[PDB]
Enzyme design. Structure first.
Site, mmCIF file in Angstrom:
data_model
loop_
_atom_site.group_PDB
_atom_site.id
_atom_site.type_symbol
_atom_site.label_atom_id
_atom_site.label_comp_id
_atom_site.label_asym_id
_atom_site.label_seq_id
_atom_site.Cartn_x
_atom_site.Cartn_y
_atom_site.Cartn_z
ATOM 1 N N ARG A 249 -0.652 -1.553 -7.061
ATOM 2 C CA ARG A 249 -0.823 -2.765 -6.322
ATOM 3 C C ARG A 249 -1.537 -3.790 -6.951
ATOM 4 N NH1 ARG A 249 -0.665 -3.126 -1.484
ATOM 5 N NH2 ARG A 249 -3.222 -3.779 -1.263
ATOM 6 N N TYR B 261 -10.065 -8.906 -7.286
ATOM 7 C CA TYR B 261 -8.972 -8.145 -7.392
ATOM 8 C C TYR B 261 -8.108 -8.659 -8.775
ATOM 9 C CZ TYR B 261 -5.455 -4.863 -6.047
ATOM 10 O OH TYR B 261 -4.365 -3.840 -5.717
ATOM 11 N N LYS C 23 -3.646 -0.322 7.589
ATOM 12 C CA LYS C 23 -5.049 -0.517 7.393
ATOM 13 C C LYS C 23 -5.549 -1.563 7.981
ATOM 14 C CE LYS C 23 -6.825 0.021 3.314
ATOM 15 N NZ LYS C 23 -6.890 -0.119 1.678
ATOM 16 N N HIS D 95 -3.387 -10.371 1.795
ATOM 17 C CA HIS D 95 -4.712 -10.758 1.813
ATOM 18 C C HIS D 95 -4.884 -12.229 2.672
ATOM 19 C CE1 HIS D 95 -6.433 -7.439 -0.505
ATOM 20 N NE2 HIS D 95 -5.695 -7.520 -1.306
ATOM 21 N N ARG E 59 0.784 -1.182 -0.126
ATOM 22 C CA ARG E 59 0.048 -0.018 0.053
ATOM 23 C C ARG E 59 0.976 1.264 -0.120
ATOM 24 N NH1 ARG E 59 -3.401 -2.753 4.787
ATOM 25 N NH2 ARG E 59 -4.507 -4.402 3.608
ATOM 26 N N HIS F 201 -2.372 3.776 -6.801
ATOM 27 C CA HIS F 201 -3.015 2.523 -5.800
ATOM 28 C C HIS F 201 -2.873 1.718 -7.035
ATOM 29 C CE1 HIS F 201 -4.694 0.278 -3.126
ATOM 30 N NE2 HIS F 201 -6.026 0.078 -3.554
#
Lengths: 53, 356, 274, 54, 55
Positions: free
Chosen positions: B311, B342, B235, B333, B212, B308
């Site tokens: 990623r 994703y 996060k 994850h 991130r 972003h």
């Protein structure tokens, strides 16, 4: 748990005649209303003489 | 006055009375006398009511000056102010708290400060839909979700019985942000030449590690031991260890070559510093990335990519280069629900189906 | 008629007395009921509003005792749910509230800290040190460690009957912590020479000791050492948490689970090459 | 849960003479009947009066 | 499980005398009837006195 006609009227301020008290029963002048056991009426300890009109 | 107001009058019309024997009378605006109306309350009242007319808007009360008062005084804004305090006790992560306040400040400006019980479901959808036509579909979803929760707490503290916000629908919003491709990455890479040096290193470090942006500008050179990069996300707060032995053959970049390229050029306490040997905010690393985007002269459908997206492209390449179980742990994850979301393309490049 | 809140709480305690639970457990609920007594007026259940319930609840949340609010809210709710079953009321005004999420703030214990406490336990009797090493070598709970008799040891084993859960395990007298320098065998025999009683852990008078004094004296050696933490200073129970944390990197994770007395599964993971 | 003739008369709207209590049983004015167990009736926990007439 | 003369009578609606219970046994007022074992009687778990008379 309940109170007889005499035991209820005797606690009153102005104990009226038996007949007169029996009349306030047929005229629903007593609320909560009394229930008939066998030959006598057993009112509630909180039963009061609600005089309306 | 003589009698002033009394207690029995509190529930009786102006031209009505109430004797000692529970009887009521009908005053006369001619001499002051009275007659006999009824024995009941609402009956004698209604009679005096139909006599002249009903009460009015509220209550009279007009002596000479004033006195004590203890009536109703419900308000929405008043509750909201007490709601913002309860939120600060739910243990939040700073930033998240600001998000709520940004949604609450919009409600008090779009909805009257009248009693909560008086707030109908209509006036809630009137304001909600007012932001749905402006394209702010995502905003309407957060505003209704935050406003709805505000009432749940209100019901818990004896204020309202039901939530008139759980009856309205939530506006669905599809992601308009496009995806980045490998052939688009190099284009921006060459357009970042006019830009500082740290932009060409932060882009290669955000595609090789797939970390991130916020956790990319918080990594010190002390978080690298024995060839392992211990990164603690902010996060989700999930810790991981990225080995220096990782390189993308789809762009021609090594994590061991890019890392050392940030020790001489940049030089600082953080892997990604500025031209002043000092850390750089996360809300600026992406800013300088958008400039090269528009300058590179590209063309996408809808909302253009962003920093972003590095990623997403990193994981997209890490799924075909090695395996799927690899581009699922590197990103931090754990769930198996977004591993397929994703992976989507959103309509950029057709999913080329090979013989396999 | 016969209504009122308090009158019910009296007929409610007897109900829980027939539920058939642990002794200490029944006491925990009673302490919660008494708190509700001095927390809410004496009036019919149908009169109690959700506001008054949250007014008392939040009052304990602001004081810092958020954990207590959860149990009191979960217990008061059960009373009403059983009240409706009798036909007293019709709704549970407690199911409208929300329990306050509390986060554990009891710091853990490390290897360096333990060594600093064991040495500081010098001023303390000669059974505390033995209780420390034993609680870390067995990784058992303080409750059962006091009910351990020398008759439990059978042919190199250590039959332990957990009181809390009720799990039955047997820890062999061959274990040894490779980080502090403690041996199960050398520790047990050290208790047979120094102490000398019916229970593995006894007093200076050769008599069993309560589980409330084992962790009590441990606290004195904690504040006497002069070690600072973040939150609430670890306790004797933390020796159980430190035990597993060590055995997981000394032998295996499947071993720590079997030692503690667990059955089912329920920080810095490594990203393998494959 | 079964009670005696004395214990039952104690838990009624109005306690009367034992003689009258025995009479109701004989006249079958209570659901369900007491059922003589030895030499003393045993009322049921739900055995209430009914009363008839003509 | 078989209860004794005293144990059985100690579980009835109204505990009576030992000699009294012995009388029922002889009058078959115990259904089912107890079993002779040693010197005392052994009643059944669900044993209850009954009335073998129809007036």
């Amino acid at each position: 748990m309940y109170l007889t006609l005499q035991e209820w009227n005797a606690r009153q301020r102005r104990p009226r005649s038996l007949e007169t008290v029996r009349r306030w029963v047929r005229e629903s002048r007593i609320f909560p209303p009394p229930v008939k056991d066998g030959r006598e009426y057993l009112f509630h300890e909180s039963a009061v003489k609600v005089d309306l009109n | 006055m003589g009698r002033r107001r009394s207690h029995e009058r509190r529930d009786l019309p102006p031209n009505l009375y109430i004797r000692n024997n529970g009887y009521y009378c009908y005053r006369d605006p001619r001499t002051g006398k009275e007659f006999g109306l009824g024995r009941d309350r609402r009956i004698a009242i209604t009679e005096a009511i139909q006599a002249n007319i009903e009460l009015f808007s509220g209550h009279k009360h007009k002596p000479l000056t004033a006195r004590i008062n203890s009536d109703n005084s419900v308000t929405l804004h008043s509750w909201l102010d007490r709601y913002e305090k309860i939120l600060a006790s739910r243990g939040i992560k700073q930033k998240t708290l600001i998000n709520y306040m940004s949604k609450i400040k919009a409600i008090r400006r779009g909805l009257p400060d009248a009693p909560l019980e008086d707030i109908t479901t209509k006036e809630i959808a009137a304001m909600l839909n007012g932001y749905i036509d402006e394209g702010k579909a995502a905003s309407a979803k957060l505003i209704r979700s935050t406003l709805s929760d505000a009432f749940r707490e209100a019901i818990a503290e004896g204020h309202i019985t039901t939530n008139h916000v759980a009856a309205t629908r939530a506006a669905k919003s599809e992601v308009r942000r496009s995806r980045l491709t490998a052939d688009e990455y190099l284009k921006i890479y060459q357009a970042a030449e006019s830009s500082p040096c740290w932009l060409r290193l932060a882009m290669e470090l955000a595609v090789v590690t797939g970390q991130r942006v916020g956790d990319l500008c918080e990594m010190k050179w002390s978080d690298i031991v024995d060839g392992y990069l211990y990164v603690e996300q902010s996060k989700t707060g999930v810790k991981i260890a990225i080995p220096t032995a990782l390189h993308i053959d789809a762009l021609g970049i090594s994590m061991k070559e890019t890392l050392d390229k940030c020790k001489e050029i940049l030089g600082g306490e953080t892997i990604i510093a500025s031209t002043r040997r000092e850390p750089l905010s996360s809300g600026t690393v992406s800013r300088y990335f958008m400039r090269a985007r528009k300058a590179s002269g590209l063309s996408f459908e809808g909302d253009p990519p962003t920093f972003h997206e590095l990623r997403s492209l990193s994981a997209r390449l890490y799924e075909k280069q090695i395996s799927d179980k690899f581009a699922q742990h590197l990103l931090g994850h754990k769930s198996d629900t977004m591993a397929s979301q994703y992976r989507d393309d959103r309509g950029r490049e057709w999913d080329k189906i090979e013989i396999k």
